[PDB]
Amino acid sequence: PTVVGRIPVLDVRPVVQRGRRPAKAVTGESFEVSATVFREGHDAVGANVVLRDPRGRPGPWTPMRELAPGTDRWGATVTAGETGTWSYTVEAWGDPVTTWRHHARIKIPAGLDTDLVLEEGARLYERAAADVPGREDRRELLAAVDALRDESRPAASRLAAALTPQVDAVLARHPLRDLVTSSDPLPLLVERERALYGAWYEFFPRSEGTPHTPHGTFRTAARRLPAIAAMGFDVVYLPPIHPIGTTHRKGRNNTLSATGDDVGSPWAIGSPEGGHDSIHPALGTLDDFDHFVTEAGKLGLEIALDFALQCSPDHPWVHKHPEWFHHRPDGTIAHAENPPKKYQDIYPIAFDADPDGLATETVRILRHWMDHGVRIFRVDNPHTKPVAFWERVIADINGTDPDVIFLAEAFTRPAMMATLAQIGFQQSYTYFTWRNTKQELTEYLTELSGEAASYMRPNFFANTPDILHAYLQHGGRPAFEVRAVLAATLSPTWGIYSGYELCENTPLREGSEEYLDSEKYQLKPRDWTRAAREGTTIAPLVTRLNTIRRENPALRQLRDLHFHPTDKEEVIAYSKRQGSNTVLVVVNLDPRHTQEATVSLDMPQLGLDWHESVPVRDELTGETYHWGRANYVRLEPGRTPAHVCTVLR
Amino acid sequence: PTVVGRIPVLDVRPVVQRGRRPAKAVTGESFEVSATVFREGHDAVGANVVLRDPRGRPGPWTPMRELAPGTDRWGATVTAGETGTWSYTVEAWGDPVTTWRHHARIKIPAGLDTDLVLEEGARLYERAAADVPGREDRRELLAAVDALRDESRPAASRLAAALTPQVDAVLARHPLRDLVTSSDPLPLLVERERALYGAWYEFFPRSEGTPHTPHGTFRTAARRLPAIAAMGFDVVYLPPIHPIGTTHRKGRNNTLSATGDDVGSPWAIGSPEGGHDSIHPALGTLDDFDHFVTEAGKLGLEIALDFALQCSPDHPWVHKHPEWFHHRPDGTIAHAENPPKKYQDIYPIAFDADPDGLATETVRILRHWMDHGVRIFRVDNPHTKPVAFWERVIADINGTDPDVIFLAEAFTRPAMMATLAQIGFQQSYTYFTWRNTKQELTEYLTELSGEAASYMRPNFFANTPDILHAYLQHGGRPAFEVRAVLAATLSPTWGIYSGYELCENTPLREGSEEYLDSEKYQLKPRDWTRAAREGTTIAPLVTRLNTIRRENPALRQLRDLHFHPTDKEEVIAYSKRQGSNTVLVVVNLDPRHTQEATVSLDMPQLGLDWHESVPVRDELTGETYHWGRANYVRLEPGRTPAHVCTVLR
Ligand SMILES: OCC1=C[C@H](NC2CCCCC2)[C@H](O)[C@@H](O)[C@@H]1O[C@H]1O[C@H](CO)[C@@H](O)[C@H](O)[C@H]1O
Ligand SMILES: OCC1=C[C@H](NC2CCCCC2)[C@H](O)[C@@H](O)[C@@H]1O[C@H]1O[C@H](CO)[C@@H](O)[C@H](O)[C@H]1O
Secondary structure, eight states: OOSSOSSOEEEEESOBGGGTBOEEEETTOEEEEEEEEOOSSSSOEEEEEEEEOTTSOBOOOEEOEESSTTSOEEEEEEEOOSSEEEEEEEEEEEOHHHHHHHHHHHHTTTTSSHHHHHHHHHHHHHHHHHHOOOHHHHHHHHHHHHHHHOTTSOHHHHHHTTSSHHHHHHHHHSOOOEEEEEOOOEEEEEEOGGGTOEEEEEOOGGGSOOSSSOSOOHHHHGGGHHHHHHTTOSEEEEOOOSOBOOTTOOBGGGBSSOOSSOOOOTTSBOBTTBOTTSOOGGGOOHHHHHHHHHHHHHTTOEEEEEEOOEEOTTSTHHHHOGGGSOOOTTSOOOOEEETTEEETTOEEOOOSSOHHHHHHHHHHHHHHHHHTTOOEEEESSGGGSOHHHHHHHHHHHHHHOTTOEEEEOOOSOHHHHHHHHHTTOSEEOOSGGGOOSHHHHHHHHHHHTTGGGGTOOBOEESOBTTBOOHHHHHHHHHHHHHHHHHHHHHOSEEEEETTTTTTOOOBSSTTOOSBTTOTTSSOOOOOHHHHHHTTOOOHHHHHHHHHHHHHOGGGGOSSOEEEEOBSSTTEEEEEEEETTEEEEEEEEOOSSSOEEEEEEOOGGGGTOOTTOOEEEEETTTOOEEEEOSEEEEEEOTTTOSEEEEEEOO | OOSSOSSOEEEEESOBGGGTBOEEEETTOEEEEEEEEOOSSSSOEEEEEEEEOTTOOBOOOEEOEESSTTSOEEEEEEEOOSSEEEEEEEEEEEOHHHHHHHHHHHHTTTTSSHHHHHHHHHHHHHHHHTTOOSHHHHHHHHHHHHHHHOTTSOHHHHHHHTSOHHHHHHHHSSOOOEEEEEOOOEEEEEEOGGGTSEEEEEOOGGGSOOSSOOSOOHHHHGGGHHHHHHTTOOEEEEOOOSOBOOTTOOBGGGBSSOOSSOOOOTTSBOBTTBOTTSOOGGGOOHHHHHHHHHHHHHTTOEEEEEEOOEEOTTSTHHHHOGGGBOBOTTSOBOOEEETTEEETTOEEBOOSSOHHHHHHHHHHHHHHHHHTTOOEEEEESGGGSOHHHHHHHHHHHHHHOTTOEEEEEOOSOHHHHHHHHHHTOSEEEOSGGGOOSHHHHHHHHHHHTTGGGGTOOEEEESOBTTBOOHHHHHHHHHHHHHHHHHHHHHOSEEEEETTTTTTOOOBSSTTOOSBTTOTTTSOOOOOHHHHHHTTOOOHHHHHHHHHHHHHOGGGGOSSOEEEEOBSSTTEEEEEEEETTEEEEEEEEOOSSSOEEEEEEOOGGGGTOOTTOOEEEEETTTOOEEEEOSEEEEEEOTTTOSEEEEEEOO
16 A cells, blocks of 8 residues: 555645645635656656535646656646635646657657557557547547558658647547546635735724814714725724723823823723723724724725734723633733733733633624624734634634634744644735845745745735834835835735825834834824825825726736846836736835836746737836836836836737 | 644654655664744743654653744754654643743842742742652752742842752753643654665676686675675675576677677576576576575675566566566567667566566565575666555565665656655665765755755765766776765765776766776676785775774764865865764865865864864874864875864864
């Protein structure tokens, strides 16, 4: 009972944890299944991929190719349909027609065994014909058999008849496969399209108030949705919406002690008004939330709620479930840290005393918001909770509600970010904000779209309430334009935190990535109407970007991405492809200086011969350009951060 | 039911084919088990490796360490004992005592929480004490517990009582390990030391004959073993010893037609005189072979036989089992090709008609030679036979006879060479002869001793009857010296084909790696006594080298090897280590010109601080040197090919 089969087929990829977790995909996504495939001896091998939908039904005949000469690594692109748990195997086989055609091309002109090789071809094409099921397809192959056997023509002319394209036609359709060896099935989990594709917008409802009631409510915040929908966003992510604690409530600018009307951080969940299942009374009631969810739905927006498995000291849990916390010998509970950060206003959950209780409550809490229309959750700081916990929770929820998307806010070491993705988290935050040079971007994106894409889906938020990167601080408005072009086109999921559009870039101090007067500790009213009137918002750019994404399926996927070399360190270029769609992007990473460069396009990667012209259209400007293997660009920051181009038919 | 445990343990290496084949080791070999290990939060993890012998008995406590900061990858070295099938797991755990000690060294001198931090520690040393089952070991920790709680003692003095190395002992002896998580078991296959370590010598018995009987016999050939054993070799590899066919026998110098007395290629196995189970009658009988095998053993030599699963057209199988061959439509059998080489004198075995019959006969044949003292098989050209065939045959033979070593002569693409190693082959031939620059050699060895060492064991033959590399052709005798030093110290198994020591370097043509007047097609008599008197043999160095290998256990293992930088491209340097033994080698790869260089030793890789003296002894010359972080060397070809140095304490 051997491990290797008749024709070796080994290390079928994508693979997640040696096959005990599923590789990931979404409806309509293309990705490449691969395998090492070879045989003993010198004869030709073939391989093909077999996708099985959740019912056992196999997909189209999908043959593979050697991906680089002499490597014995084979690949083919396959595509997922209906959501569910799929499986895939690679089949390898002896390819006798390629083997024979290769030998007949040398032996027949050399006059070697011409009578034997031609009868070899007759007998074999007859065998190829026994499985071809069309009357015409059969009779075509069987005529070549007779032409191979016709002794009254020269051998060179008898062989020629087995290589006409009409024979390759019937043979590409129904190949003759010897010694068919299968790999063991590997699991694939296909999820709804939002799991991979979508633009996210984060805002605080409480900041969208009125002059006479400055603390916003769901009813006042619902009026902010049309602006957000108009920018072309699909998901609206809310910070925690529940009662905020008062004990150790932080004041403005992350000061330890609040004052009389300081609002405190929404992540300080819990007070005697309720916990994670309740609405913060200054926002309104549970019906105000439904109104919000409904108004959001009407505009085409999906609500994502923040799940922060933590408490403020006034959460009812603190006394209702003391065992969900770790108490020091004097009974105090150390405030949470994500060092060097200090979170004095909140308690971390301890998990080893009553793990069943936390699991049951977490899914109850989540099923509560699920009942009110929340189908997406931004999971706050998951890496400070056990990995097997999220694995169990995501399984429970998805077993009944497979459409529920979880997003992991895990800024941490590479191991944990990877593991959290592989145990269930549909999407992941990334290092995107700390990748700002051409080389950082190229490296990270080469990895995220490389092997990582079989378990991670990246969500490129260009800012968060916790991350005002120095690139944006020092670059001003042209910085905000470049990072949006970058995020919206390098990832099929990107996002911004409200105020990005207004280029809010004042840090708490220098060397800090915190916002001065951070929205986390204060209402942050914003004059959206003034900013729009005065053109001091890049909301026009954000909108056209999400428009380009919605008209171009190359931008709705992640794995098909290639960087093109340019002769300036500040100018990056790359293209993505989906079928006939080819988007091509050139960004100037200099926020401060005009750059000109030669972008030397890797023409075959766009599907073109080395010398062809390319009709492209700069979808930001609408202008059309004719490009070739080398193209002169000039990008003036402020005027034009980048060309975002589709190729034209 | 989750995939990930409480404290994650992930991607445990070494692994072969996702765990479906065993990792390899030999009795007494050391190698590193590694794992990705981490936890949620900021407290410390510990991990240890649990190796199990074939009765299940667990090995010593083997704790692991993070291999680089922030990588969450941990490792520990394990050592194999008795032959058999072992297994190994990694356990990870919360390390609460390490976390507390960290907090206690910071908080206690600052005077922060001293009474709480000291009580946290007492309660926890109390917990380590519930697991120590000895009244004294308990009271040891409990005295630290009582001193940690002694409020009549200075805080710095209570803390000291929990950090005495007298307490560090009883804790490294009985660690407090929380939430212990295990990986699933991985299999380890431990083989006798000769599978990894040993020197091979290949020669043709028929070449060692009398002037009246030029075709040698086992009885005359047995007389050549004293020279071989005295040269320090362990294994004697004989080409096929069976009847040679006459149909299409090749003549001298690989000519297609023989003459009246041309001896033919020994690989043309088979005639009505017998096949693979019979002895070529010009060699003597099966009793002469017994005499030869017995006489070889008395000298400390093991016999390795060539197994070539193929036939001359006169083999009895050609008519007894036509189904073991591939027939053209007229019933003839195409002669074997390994293009562009043509082997007109032999037919390849075909495997798809009677695979059980071929298997049964193959293990029948091998058990015959096993019965006559042959416990090693050099499998000729295995990559022209199905991979699963070798898997099932090697499993079968080793199932009854686990000591039988198979060596695979597969010069081919890396996929096949890897798989044959992973399916059973104890040793592999390598690319060694085609790696002659400093960069080629370093790249190859970094690969062979890196991850490849978990499944392949290299046999560094510096020449074969089929490979006289141009390096040896053009370099002459100093080239032959360099490659022997290189082979004998880079791999724990190396070998030479007889005539190497006489520096036979005359090729078939320019551009060939074939031997002129190949022993494969003609008796090749050699005046061994004359060559030694005339000093035209490098047998002294071969003998010196094999002695150095036998006194220096660093040269009897593969995985611990480190390259040291030198400022001349032609001078390579490296060291290997096994326990206290450190061998350090500096070779001049220039065969024609004296090279001088500064060898800049990577002192930590030798186990020294950058300022230490290193007393070495050049095992080739007996000279003694005092070396340091940087060393000037001068190597003259002919006089000194290399320093091979042992360190002195
Ligand atoms: O939930 C805790 C936390 C961390 C998350 N992720 C960070 C961590 C590391 C890298 C940057 C992102 C969340 O997104 C972030 O909103 C949150 O912090 C905010 O809420 C806390 C509770 O009231 C305050 O104590 C704190 O001062 C304030 O900043
Ligand atoms: O057995 C097959 C073969 C090849 C092996 N592998 C080579 C391949 C090329 C690269 C270097 C190694 C082995 O060395 C070698 O035992 C063998 O050759 C010999 O066997 C044939 C049968 O009699 C003769 O026709 C031929 O003339 C003679 O030379």
